[PDB]
Symmetry: D2
Subunit: 116 residues, 4 copies
């Protein structure tokens, strides 16, 4: 979890093709009083990654949420999915280390975790 230039990265692996899920919209939100505030929005590259998802601003500890717009990813291929989108809520307790959040994606199932 050693620090990188940006505190947050994500990676989407299409378990059905064995290849990265490219051009997938992913948003980042910060938890506030009862609601959520959007910090950024980006699209995964040809390798299904967003190496720098946090906006170019000072980060703070607290609860956050990344929302993978995978339902749209599949709909664009005319494929159905049980999940319209996949929100992953997590906690950042140290702003001096890196957080990598991969998503192993299938149409009717998925896995996510804090990567290394």
């Amino acid at each position: 979890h050693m620090a990188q230039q940006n505190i947050l990265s994500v990676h989407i692996l299409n378990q059905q093709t064995g290849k990265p899920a490219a051009d997938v919209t992913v948003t980042l939100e910060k938890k506030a009083d009862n609601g959520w505030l959007q910090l950024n929005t980006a699209k995964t590259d040809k390798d299904g990654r967003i190496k720098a998802l946090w906006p170019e601003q000072t980060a703070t500890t607290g609860d956050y949420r990344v929302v993978f717009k995978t339902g749209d990813y599949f709909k664009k291929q005319n494929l159905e999915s049980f999940f319209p989108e996949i929100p992953v809520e997590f906690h950042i307790n140290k702003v001096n280390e890196h957080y990598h959040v991969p998503l192993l994606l299938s149409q009717y199932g998925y896995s996510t975790y804090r990567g290394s």
Copy 2:
């Protein structure tokens, strides 16, 4: 996915113990016009299940989300987790079918899918 009785059930399996996650609070919300609206809340039984999570009202097609309060579950075990809670957003396309949503839970990773 034939209709049974209550349209929604969930099950939490602790992958670190190979045993069910009991007494975990789970909320159900509906994606409505003006945002999300809570439909019901219950706790997993001794077997880590909630056999009938839908409230007493006709379900409609649309987006929903169950939120597993797993952060508090691990806390009671003197364990930390990357996720304060785990939201799972899903879509009901046919109201005449049963929906089962299992959660395979670990402190820093999880899996979910549409069960049988």
Copy 3:
């Protein structure tokens, strides 16, 4: 409620369609003095299950292996897979309880765990 049932069952769920993988061959082997001994072989039913996989012999605490012949399953769907077959090695600690081994299947990825 499975205590008086056959000690070993499996279930294969296709995460790309959200439906069971039927008619898939699954073998059961027992770990012995340097090597493996095949105890049985069966095919998943229409619900992607094998209710009673344990053969007519006294079970003993030790290591075993179930091999899901998923490569052939995918070929029948005209799909390629990273795995020719999927072996899962597990340990039986008590011969007086039920063991359920589920398989969450995708073409290039899978998950398994001790069923609850």
Copy 4:
């Protein structure tokens, strides 16, 4: 971007600690006429990786198998596991590409897939 590296790498992530699984023995075997033959054995580094698992010999398309000795890994932490070891069988159909096989590990459940 891994095209100029050794052709086979693995990575083990402990989903219970959210950290890499270090010093874990991993073997590599090739399937041939007279059964399986071992090709190499190595141990994951401090980052839970084995960057170059393929030995100094010409690689040939076909079926292979890596076995993660995870049962021993947990035992050292005074923890039990449903799996004595975790074998992963896969096909190499193009030796001009890199193959990465990650393992998401928990005591009673795991996931593996073709990485990127």
